[PDB]
Design a binder for these strands. Structure first.
Length: 166
DNA sequence: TAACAGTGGCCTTATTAAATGACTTCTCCATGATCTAC
């Protein structure tokens, strides 16, 4: 039918950050499609058609439900409280690099406590060359990326906004 | 008017090439929930 969200690298109004964002969405969608082969499994029957330089999203029912499902599945938190982006191959990456990525995101994007709720300071002692070194990182319980779906959709009609979002 | 215009041997031997301590101090935050006044 008609895609509800269409994104292209050839759009003339996009900057570098916009294109990097479409690339991240493309990687996340590839990983999700590997995780959820059937569109019925995905909330709202959300389905996508990915090309070399275009992203199109189709879904049924309320826009808020489908967007919330996609965003919640895209941005996750593991048991330890680290940022778990399903766009990246998290099983293949080790714990130290995951901690590095989480700390970088928390120090660059989530600079402000207004956009994350901090948990306890989790300490882990991983042995290295017959020596156990204690990594101490700030675990999280929520960050704005998880619940931006509310800002993407209208409060009452629960549909995609037709205006600009600040 | 001439024939010479120095023949030698050396051209530094030692020793030490830095010892200290300092390697910026402050401040200017951004953003949303809430208080509050109109």
């Amino acid at each position: 039918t008609q895609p509800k969200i269409s994104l292209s690298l050839h759009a003339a109004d996009t900057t570098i950050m916009h294109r990097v964002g479409m690339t991240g969405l493309y990687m996340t969608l590839k990983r999700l499609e590997k995780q959820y082969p059937l569109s019925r499994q995905r909330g709202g029957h959300i389905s996508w058609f990915l090309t070399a330089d275009t992203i199109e999203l189709f879904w049924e029912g309320s826009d808020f439900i489908a967007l919330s499902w996609l965003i919640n599945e895209s941005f996750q938190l593991d048991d330890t409280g680290l940022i778990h982006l399903v766009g990246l191959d998290n099983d293949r990456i080790d714990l130290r690099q995951k901690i590095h990525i989480h700390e970088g995101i928390c120090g660059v994007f989530l600079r402000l406590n207004k956009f994350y709720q901090a948990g306890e300071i989790i300490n882990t002692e991983l042995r290295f060359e017959e020596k156990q070194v204690e990594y101490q990182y700030k675990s999280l319980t929520w960050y704005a990326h998880q619940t931006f779906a509310e800002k993407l959709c209208e409060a009452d009609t629960q549909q995609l906004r037709h205006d600009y979002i600040q």
